[PDB]
Amino acid sequence: KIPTRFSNRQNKTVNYNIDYSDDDLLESEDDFHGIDIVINHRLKTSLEEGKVLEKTVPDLNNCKENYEFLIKWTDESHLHNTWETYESIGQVRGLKRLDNYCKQFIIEDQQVRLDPYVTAEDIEIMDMERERRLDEFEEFHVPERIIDSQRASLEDGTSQLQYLVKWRRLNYDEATWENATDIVKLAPEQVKHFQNRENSKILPQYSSNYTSQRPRFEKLSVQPPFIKGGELRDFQLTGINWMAFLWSKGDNGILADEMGLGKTVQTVAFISWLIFARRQNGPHIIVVPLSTMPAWLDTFEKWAPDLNCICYMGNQKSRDTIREYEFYTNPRAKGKKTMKFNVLLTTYEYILKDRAELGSIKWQFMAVDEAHRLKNAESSLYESLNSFKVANRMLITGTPLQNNIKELAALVNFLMPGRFTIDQEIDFENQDEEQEEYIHDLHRRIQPFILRRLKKDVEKSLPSKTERILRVELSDVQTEYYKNILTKNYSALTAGAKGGHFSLLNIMNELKKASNHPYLFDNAEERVLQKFGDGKMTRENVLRGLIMSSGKMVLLDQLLTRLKKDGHRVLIFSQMVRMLDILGDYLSIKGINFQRLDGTVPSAQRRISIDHFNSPDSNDFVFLLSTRAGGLGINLMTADTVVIFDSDWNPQADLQAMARAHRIGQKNHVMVYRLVSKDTVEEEVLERARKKMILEYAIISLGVTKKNEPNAGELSAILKFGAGNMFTDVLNHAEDLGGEEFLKQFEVTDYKADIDWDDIIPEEELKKLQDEEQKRKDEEY
Amino acid sequence: RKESYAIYVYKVLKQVHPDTGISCKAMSIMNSFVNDVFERIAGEASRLAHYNKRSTITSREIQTAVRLLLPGELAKHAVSEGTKAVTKYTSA
Amino acid sequence: KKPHRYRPGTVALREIRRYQKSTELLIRKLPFQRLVREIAQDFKTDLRFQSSAVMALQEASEAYLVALFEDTNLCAIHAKRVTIMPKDIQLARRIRGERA
Amino acid sequence: AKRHRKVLRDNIQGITKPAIRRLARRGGVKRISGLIYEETRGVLKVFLENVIRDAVTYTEHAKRKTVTAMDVVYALKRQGRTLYGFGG
């Protein structure tokens, strides 16, 4: 209370309050319909004057009387867009946006139209994106969901019924109050869905109270009637039976089906069964990646149209709109608020951002899609999701085990925290019977809790995928760079164009860079150009330096020529985007129509590139990827060959890379070439990947969905394989019990090139390169 | 086992403000301040002992270092504090 | 295109009164880490950095720049001006002894 | 020419114009001329290399490759700029 010590020093009192008020500055401080979005323009202002004066370029004042612009105004609903003119606007807020649209679109469009140096590819891609935008803007007219209805009084308008409308690709901050009449006349299906949601027969407050007394589940041999949708398949119905039988015992599960089998359809049908049959229609939460979430939204709209599935993304005001307009039946009260929605779709970012506003909900079910993101128990998402108050949880993934047993332990501790323990990592050096007994114990422990179906067991029309490991020797530049890094030679590495502070931290990263290409190091192309092509760099020796600098590039060039000779298209996957830049330059000087995708490319250009590669009239031949980008939703149907340029530590990343082209319904035999640098650090990369594949084939593949006696022999055989080193008509795109299948695609096919400097760029390619270089000087540019 | 000054600074804080806490960064700043003042006074007293050809550091050297380093009323109040502490320690 | 524009100087006074109350670092962390690493690779190669070392460098650099800007503002006020110029920084560093 | 160098040289430009403006606002500066920012970047670079050289010397005395916070504290202390909050 009272202090026992004071100061005898005679200080003056000091006001330490540093809070300031700007009330003395209000003299110069204080003492909604404007232009928001300009969508499209029309060349006729009022009427067609004539076809004359079609040449030259218009100025800013010339466009002020010749064009009319489509305007979406501030605080409007994209249906009151008006075709306006500069003199028809006057002076409103947002005129600078109109000026910017006019300048950018009109000036650059007439510049690309009137430039003689414009190819057909540029004009068709510019038209591509142009139409895409115009239509994305056209999709905003269609209503998607009606939130709430009110009675509003206008200026002597008595009472009017006003709907709160959400749009198709817009969000809840764009939800607008609109008249009921044109909303009914526009899309009455959404209106009748709103009245179906108003006096709905399924609410969280009407849920049953099964407390360890859940009824027994009979097997459903037919599709249930409340799941309308399309038509469930037989393996999907078996999945429904497995999910319902595991829920009836009060247990949680991992749906480990391989991609393409429709896991989303299975879990939406299970949610429909939980709501309709067992009357557990309370608050369910589904946490998905953001890129896949439209594929969840339309699945919920199609297969379970009677459900109150809501969407939880966006900024703060949109999530506030969802929170105080759609969570509660009685949002204006302050006591116990019952829930109104049935299913809440959300993402990981808003689990972390809004754990306080979502953790205080008595959830009846959790479904986490792509649960390998939950593979780390020390992550923030694991601590956020594990603290939720949910009765039943479910993990949906394709790769339950990726690197070690600890990730599977984290998944089963997220499901059942305590009944499963793992305290021994599998080591491929003992090979004793105790490890085999431990493996069989983990087999029999997680057997009913994991359901996994492969793409070969169902849909018996999928062509096989063959993986060939090609080990190539190193070039002289690669060998001297490897020797300089491995036996650290700062003086020798700095020598050549004054260095540039060569960083030898992360030695294995530099060894992988040296195994890929010498040009990944700074000031390394100059030495190869000045030592072999005598530094002139005259458009032909640059390609020779690119090909002959790295030992992977000669095999890549031979594969590219052979696949161009045949009717094949190729994806090329790399772990580095700088090596992707190197290959992009190699195909640019080489002159091959290529497309590219990595983390730097935004999602719109990603969609453009994927649609351009998959078009039937595509001139593209090779499509480059960074391996870990794009998620699981990339469709690469048209390609046939996959070249893994750089191997990953995680083999599931390379498996997803191969499954980008090896999807369901593929019409060609997918061929995979893995490029390996001989006697390098990539050898132990492949050894660790082989050990992880051995581990995944041991635990996961032998516990899917008289052989018990031979299991004690074949586990010992696969452990002897796991304790052995894999490193002791070659480019054919063809191939002419399950245990011997796994012994394939681990063989090493050594490739020897022995190609000298003057063999590459033959007389057909050298004549084309020299004529293009000679004609470039005639046209200057 | 970090050998800090945190508990004594906390007891002094409870003497002067019995209902006021302290953050960890402020405690680190206070520990750095005590270490800085310790090494300033000890270095000045070491220099004073070396200047007078003395092999020992007594309370006179510490007193002279306090009157040299601390300014104004801080100096004389610290001299009174240390003097009555030495007087209390000697008699008992 | 809205009315009620503010007078030039009261907004700057508002930021003066705002940033003198707060105590956070006014420089973004990643450009400062890149600057520290770029400066440090001249003296020695293969240098690792603790995060607290970069934070101590940022605290000291921000305190040094704020004190230099106070001396620079005093220099500019002494020259019957309210705008700081590089000659004010040069005079402040010369009187401080950094340029002397 | 998609390929380029991994290293970056304009890391002094990472100390942006609004950062220098905020640092002047903390210093009580009302109006700033346009030539202030290059001078401020040069002054900051000189101060940073002066501190960093001494910290690196303290690091190589201990036979280390990692610049700890204590080396930065000692480097700032030797030139007469004592910094609290990191020495404990």
Automatic annotation (TrEMBL), chain C:
Q: Which UniProt keywords apply?
A: Acetylation, ADP-ribosylation, Chromosome, DNA-binding, Hydroxylation, Methylation, Nucleosome core, Nucleus, Ubl conjugation
Subcellular localization is given as: Chromosome; Nucleus
Q: Which GO terms describe its cellular component?
A: nucleosome; nucleus
Tell me the gene name: LOC121398065
Self-association or partners: how does it assemble? The nucleosome is a histone octamer containing two molecules each of H2A, H2B, H3 and H4 assembled in one H3-H4 heterotetramer and two H2A-H2B heterodimers. The octamer wraps approximately 147 bp of DNA.
Protein name in the entry:
Histone H3
- UniProt entry tagged with the keyword Ubl conjugation: yes
Positions modified as N6,N6,N6-trimethyllysine? 1
Q: What is its main location?
A: nucleus
**A GO MF term:** protein heterodimerization activity
Q: Where is the Core Histone H2A/H2B/H3 domain?
A: 8-95
Family, according to the entry, reads as follows: Belongs to the histone H3 family.
